Every structure is written in C-alpha cells, then in structure tokens.
C-alpha cells in the first residue's frame, strides 16, 4: 500500500461523547489497538494491564522491540487520569502513512475515570507539543517522532463527522466517524476556502478569539474574556467550553434568541436532556454562533459559524425511539476556551504545524438542514487583536 490520502479518509470511528479513535499497531509482532485522537495533550499512552472497561491491552512481554525506559509517568486531564511505565516501541497506523516509527509509549497500569465503559478505544494519541507532555518536555511526542524519522510532512488534518457519518442500517445508533489525514490536506473533506489563524504558542494548539456573535449579535465582552487564560482547539474534548463569564453571557443570549427562558436551568447546565418528537426538533428557533479568529495578516480576522445541530448533541438510549433527545453541549470552564467536537464537527481543521497555523473550512460532512449551513467567512477588518491574548499579569 502507498499511504496515499485516499487510504486515510474515514479512518476514525467513535461513539458520541466518547472521542474519536484511529486504529494503530504497536510492537513486534504488531498488536492492534484503537487509540483516541487528542489534539489537547501530548502523550501517547495505551492500556497495558487488565481493566473492566478494556477489551484488550498492550502486552509488552509479547513484543521483541519493546524497550523499557525505567521511568514512571502520571498524566491528569480535565477529566480522568492515569499512570504508567515509559518505554519505546515500533508503532504503525494501518490507515495512515505507510511507515513504522519508534515512539515513546506510556504503558498504562492504573487509571481513574479515563477509560469509558463500552467505548472501543484502549489508548490515547496526544498530538500537541512537547511543552505539555508529562513528565516533561523531554518526552518527544508521537507526531514529532513521526516527522523526524520519516518524510511525512509536518501537518495533519481532522474531519470529525459526528452524526454526519455514513452508517449501515444495522450499526449502533450513537456511532460517529471521520478522517485524520496525516501529512497533508484532502480536498474531498471540505468545501469553499480554508482560512487560517496563527498558532499563538506551541504547547496546546492555542489560538486567539477576537469576537463572538450569537444570532449575528456581538456578545460585547472585552475580547480578553474569550481567551482567559487560553483558547485551544481540542479533538479530545466533547463540548464548546467557555470561561464562566462568557458562558453566562452565551446562555443569556441563546435563551433570548430562541425564547427558551423557561427551559429549566438544569438543561443549560447539562444536567437534563431536552426531548422532542422524532423529526420535529425546531432547529430554526436556535441561533447560529460565530467565533471570529485572528487571521494571518495585520488587522484581519475571519469567522467560523456553527449551527444548533453542532451544539445540541443527540443522546441515544435515554427515551423511546419515538423521541429525539439532546444535551446542551456548551459548558463552563475555569481553564479557558476549549473548541471541542461542538466546534470541530462543523469544519475540516488543518493543524499546519510547519506554518504555525490552524486552518478551518466548511466540512463536507457537517450536520445541517435545508435553511442553514455551518460557515467560514472573511476577511474582516479587526483592530487590536493582539490585545485579545491573555498574559500572566
């Protein structure tokens, strides 16, 4: 096989709310594992001991190419944590480039609230930069090792489809899928132009939000609030997460636009699902949300706009098939904005590490209706964009 982009199209699967994973093989002979794709962290780690929620796990003793680094590691996330033993082994991506890399691998020996009951993944691929790797930035992340040992160009792109994913009639109702194109950009995954925002600093995929509109109405906050203490693009986060103050203004504005003031507060807090009769979800009463991002030239921005189909997430197995139920998937953060699957499922997202920038284009698979579509538009003249970034005061 050639490792061409067409072979990589559709190489992700997932269950809604449980991340997206790619198949990988580790060790010699290869052991196949499904690996969550996480642009919000920088460690490659795999279940390496039994766990009630693991269908399979990595067995270092079965691999003649395993090398023990004789160092432990602990990694905490916003939700979940694990610890394990560092080592290196040969790693491949069967529907990725046609190459084999010696990479650092954390062999997970204990964990808490990390693995998800029934999820079909057994490990995590942290795609961000060494600065946020544990135990420290000397543990070269997977994508760095891939680029350094092979000729793969230093970029990847993600198309997360959500419920826009072609399924058989007989597949489980919450299955989602998508593509990770490693080494470039595949033109079948998007429509219109790609628009780029600078990667502000290489640690997380940090970006700068310069304006927010709901229903085309400016939220009118000081733009520093949008990026307090950072804004990141994160495939391993489900929601659009917003700083408290921004969250509260967002909910107020969404309620006002849609006349849902009387919806219970538990709904807005993600503690209750809203249910309508199947087929009758009134999408049109809910507003579009736009984030304007810093552009590539002086005083220039562009915006990405998502629909209620992105921020009201369908939940299966909670009511009769006669009803469609949704979770409000915009939530509060005390660690900055996270553009999770709620944002990424509208767009093809290019993590152009070589040029220190993130591209967005309308996704060919985003969920929308006959009246509205997700959008990426620009250019706009915007002043004082550099002032939008947070700095330690």
């Amino acid at each position: 096989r050639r490792g061409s982009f067409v072979e990589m199209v559709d190489n992700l699967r997932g269950k809604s709310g449980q991340g997206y994973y790619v198949e990988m093989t580790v060790g010699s002979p290869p052991q196949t594992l499904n690996i969550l794709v996480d642009t919000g962290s920088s460690n490659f780690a795999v279940g390496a001991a039994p766990h009630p929620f693991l269908h399979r796990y990595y067995q270092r003793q079965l691999s003649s190419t395993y090398r023990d680094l004789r160092k432990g590691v602990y990694v905490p996330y916003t939700q979940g944590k694990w610890e394990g033993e560092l080592g290196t082994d040969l790693v491949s991506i069967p529907h990725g480039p046609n190459v084999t890399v010696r990479a650092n691998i954390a062999a997970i020996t204990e964990s808490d609230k990390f693995f998800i009951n029934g999820s079909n993944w057994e490990g995590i691929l942290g795609l961000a930069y060494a600065e946020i790797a544990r135990p420290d930035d000397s543990l070269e992340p997977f994508f760095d090792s891939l680029v350094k040992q092979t000729h793969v160009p230093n970029l990847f792109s993600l198309q997360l489809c959500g419920a826009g994913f072609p399924l058989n009639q007989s597949e489980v109702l919450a299955s989602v899928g998508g593509s990770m194109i490693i080494g470039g950009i595949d033109h079948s995954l998007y429509t219109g132009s790609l628009w780029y925002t600078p990667i502000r600093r290489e640690w997380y995929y940090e970006v700068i939000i310069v304006r927010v509109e709901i229903n085309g109405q400016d939220l009118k906050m000081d733009c520093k609030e949008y990026n307090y203490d950072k804004s990141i693009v994160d495939s391993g986060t489900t929601n659009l997460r917003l700083p408290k103050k921004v969250f509260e203004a967002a909910v107020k504005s969404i309620k006002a636009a849609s006349s849902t003031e009387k919806f219970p507060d538990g709904f807005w807090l993600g503690e209750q699902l809203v249910c309508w009769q199947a087929g009758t979800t009134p999408w049109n009463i809910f507003p579009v949300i736009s984030l304007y991002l810093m552009g590539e030239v002086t005083n220039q921005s562009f915006r990405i706009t998502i629909l209620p189909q992105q921020y009201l997430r369908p939940v299966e197995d909670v009511a009769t098939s006669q009803d469609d139920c949704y979770k409000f998937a915009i939530s509060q953060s005390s660690t900055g904005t996270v553009m999770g699957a709620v944002i990424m499922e509208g767009f093809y997202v290019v993590f152009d590490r070589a040029r220190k920038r993130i591209g967005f284009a309308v996704s060919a698979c985003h969920v929308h209706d006959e009246f509205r579509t997700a959008a990426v538009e620009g250019p706009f003249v915007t002043l004082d964009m550099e002032d939008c970034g947070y700095n330690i005061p």
């Binding site: 709310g17 919000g40 939700q79 997460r241 993600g270 503690e271 809203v274 249910c275 009758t280 996270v338």
Partner: peptide, 21 residues
C-alpha cells in the same frame, strides 16, 4: 398533562482530554 418538549435527567457523556504544566 404531558407534552413536548419535555426534560429528563442525564448528561455527562463527555471526554475532556491534559491539565496545564
């Protein structure tokens, strides 16, 4: 006595991937 939309408990069902530093 019944009606749409209605609200039921639930939620969670999320991933939230690394803590800073």
């Amino acid at each position: 006595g019944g009606g749409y939309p209605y609200f039921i408990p639930x939620g969670x069902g999320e991933v939230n991937x690394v803590a800073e530093x």
